[PDB]
Design a protein around this ligand. Structure first.
Ligand code: RET
Ligand code: RET
Ligand code: RET
Ligand code: RET
Ligand code: RET
Lengths: 232, 224, 229, 231, 230
């Protein structure tokens, strides 16, 4: 049975699964193109893409066998991978800020509320819009604390590579992550049934941008910095 | 079809299965950032998560398929993994302590199993289980443990292995207690076991990793 | 559970190329330790191209044997994932030769996406077969154009030159087998299912394995030469 | 359904399967902890544990499914691994004596007689008692050749590591290997019926001792030498 | 159930499958015991045994389910692996002569005629005996070109290791490969198909020529790499 090109959510799942699998191999193998300062970052990136891979196989499974949005798998994957992205965030902060381990506590706290509220909405354990609002709070609390709350502590200019990582991190958590709540709105906040296709299409683009492309930017910083240190 | 959310135990199983997979990969890959002094410790850590992963697939499998607590899978998994944790201490008087810790661990698990499998009433089983566990902690003080291991990095490792067997390990008897010694609560029992395996196998290996990476970086830094 | 059907010529070809991508992937990933930092990402990308092909070859061949129909979607999804990856390789190479390298990447991607879009519309019956072929060649020739004339018309290293040529050579001579196969299938005025698949499978072998091999040969030579210091 | 605890043999296969899994990973991954002097040894060590894992999977399948002692799988496994262990013995002996090549041939001949006889017994192609004796002769001919025959050549303490590995080889053939004929006696040479439970339990233990544990001995010696030689 | 010991060839398939599995692992892992000169060699060797393994798994499936000879899996396996052994030969040849590229194309052409012929026979596409003679000609032409043709161009003392690898290559294509036609002869060239002998001989041939030949190269390479460091 060839892929059904009409099942475009079907195809999206397929594409992203391959993207996850590839990225995963790429992050692990390229660990040797970066130095000890950078290796653990690549491990975590690969680990994030890796877990998404397996969860993508299951997500696609259920879509195709039932045509229902795979909410529980979706959130289980976020539950597992969001904390690790937070760990990448922490790893970056620890290079340029005194408050890195305290921030990590609050960023984690943000993310759990963000995710729990989201899930409540989609699970029908809470009305959609209220749940969206609390979720948004969670996400925004993280942004707040990172740049305006406790995070305002240090913006150490010391390393061009660390500024890049820091820049990339901001970019991902602000515009990067914005794709998910966009997804949630499209699916649940237009006119009450669920617009299941557009929900999943957007979620799928968001995991690609946020798991694969973020990983990719960090690797590029990592390789560039690694190579300049070699020259010297 | 989609994962059934109302099955909290099923979900917990899923999550730790993934945690174990992830940790196993992480320990193996990260061996390249720790000196020869630490590599084997990371191997052993990866082995523990590895075995736990396979056993989590089956434990989960049983739960979804029948609703029964996978007691034998659980205990067999501990039987394979707990010895490897004790090995990690020997890697740190040594051969004597290992043998004593092993015996403790085996008395501990044996009694636990006895109770859960119905080969002994649960309370006496709990006491002998507790005795075995308690004997392990004892041997790390007045006993053969008062051999002040020369090496700060060795000490941070040892301290953290000291702490895990005391506070980390307590989650299991807590698990047993919840399930068998309250007013069987299979659901609560499996939730605490899951959490205990998660904390103890992942975080402990994370500790060793952390010490090892720090020690190794410092030692390559003094190579100037 | 029987022996491979010998009558089924298309099956044998799928089977073979499947194996070839499998071998190739292992080859490229393993051999990374025979090339320098300057070349390693190339080999990775090379390996990911063949690895992703491998998985899709497994599905393609299963679609063929179980139904006998042509695996258009699996075939195009495969190229959608691998072609940009091949363009990334051109970018990686071109990062030496010019400072305009990031521009070319953007343009070559757009060209190739058009090339595959046209082709797909053709085989999918979303657009008539012959005009689809035309827009197909447009994207392709546009790619070839921007490399030979236009922007890619720019320049300590005797290896980046061979790899450059390798690229210019393959995107012209190598990639040609694809529209050659499309013509064979849909442009004889039914659909020539077997010829199509045989040529595509042949093109994939040549362009994914043999291209990867050329880069490997350049990287290996350069790394052992630069080692003499 | 959960593992059945009353099926002792069943549990034994499960434990040993998993041990073979872990040890395979252990011996491969740990190769970067030993010098070029020892790597191939750890490779062969992981191969033996590796091949044994796959066979343990099948052996356990058979038992769980039929209750029959999985003879052919057992001896197929031994046929693939014993020659490898004999290869490891040759490598050690290479560092000790000039007679190393003929010893290897002699030992391979011994072990094949040994395994052939044992198998004929268990598969019912020969009486269980005489097969055992020929089995034992092959085994004993190996031991003889190491201790009194062409192997009385040179103990030659070239290295403290080579000397440790040599002695490890010398012990295992005797004390470690002895578990197998003991298991075979227990299963075929003591009763009315075949004592399959004991037989499988003892073989399981013997694979564990000889593949996993003996592999760890080579690993131990090899890590110590390599770390010492580096400084 | 337990493996069926009466099925000699069943068991034969089992034994070489596992040997291919082991040998693939051996060769990839052991690359860190040889220097850059030899690493690709070991990679090709692993690739040969790796392809063989996957094919042996299908070949055994076919022998159990049907009891028939898996002729197409076998030749498909050979079609993938022989070109690779020839690539290996070219790598050996390149350190010994300057006519290596010409030799590679010659030997490959030889080997495809060799395989196409044997297959045509076994598949029933061509009478069994003329097929044998033709396939045999392809082989012999390969042996012609190495000993008396373009191969007469040069030997090499440049290294005693390259000289060993050369010698092994010359030996293998003569005594090693000879096991294959012997098997065909056994199977199709006696009375009115001796399927067991054929398959036993071919499994033996794959073992000697893929696993054992591989081991010889590996050995040359570890000696040479170990001396090089000294
Ligand atoms: C790897 C996955 C990542 C980094 C996922 C991030 C997901 C979010 C930031 C989701 C956010 C949501 C809101 C901010 C509003 C309520 C529910 C959401 C979950 C979809
Ligand atoms: C990797 C798994 C580990 C380290 C498991 C450890 C389990 C224990 C320390 C359990 C202790 C128990 C008691 C002290 C009494 C009741 C039964 C218990 C076994 C689970
Ligand atoms: C790994 C796959 C690669 C590099 C595929 C390349 C495919 C092409 C260059 C296909 C080109 C086509 C045309 C130029 C005409 C219209 C449609 C085609 C797709 C088959
Ligand atoms: C990895 C497995 C190994 C090294 C197995 C060795 C098995 C033996 C040495 C068995 C010996 C036997 C006899 C000496 C008496 C006859 C029957 C036996 C085969 C089990
Ligand atoms: C890895 C497999 C290899 C190297 C196979 C080699 C096979 C041959 C040299 C077969 C030769 C045959 C003849 C020389 C006569 C014609 C029929 C044969 C194919 C089996």
């Amino acid at each position: 049975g060839d892929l059904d090109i009409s099942d475009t959510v079907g195809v999206s799942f397929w594409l992203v699964t391959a993207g996850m699998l590839a990225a995963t191999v790429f992050f692990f193998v390229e660990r040797d193109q970066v130095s000890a300062k950078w290796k653990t970052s690549l491990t975590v990136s690969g680990l994030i893409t890796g877990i998404a891979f397996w969860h993508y196989l299951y997500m696609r499974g259920v879509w195709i066998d039932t045509g229902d949005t795979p909410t529980v798998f979706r959130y289980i994957n976020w539950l597992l991978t969001v904390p690790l992205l937070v760990v990448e965030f922490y790893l970056i902060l620890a290079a340029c800020t005194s408050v890195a381990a305290s921030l990590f506590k609050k960023l984690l706290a943000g993310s759990l509320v963000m995710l729990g509220a989201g899930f409540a909405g989609e699970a029908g354990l809470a009305p959609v819009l209220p749940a969206f609002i609390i979720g948004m709070a969670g996400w925004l609390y993280m942004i707040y604390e990172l740049y305006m709350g406790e995070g305002k502590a240090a913006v150490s200019t010391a390393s061009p590579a660390v500024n890049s990582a820091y820049n990339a991190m901001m970019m991902i958590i602000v515009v990067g992550w914005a794709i998910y709540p966009a997804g949630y709105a499209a699916g649940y906040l237009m006119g009450g049934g669920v617009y299941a296709s557009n929900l999943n299409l957007i979620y799928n683009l968001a995991d690609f941008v946020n798991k694969i492309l973020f990983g990719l930017i960090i690797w590029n910083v990592a390789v560039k910095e690694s190579s300049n240190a070699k020259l010297l």
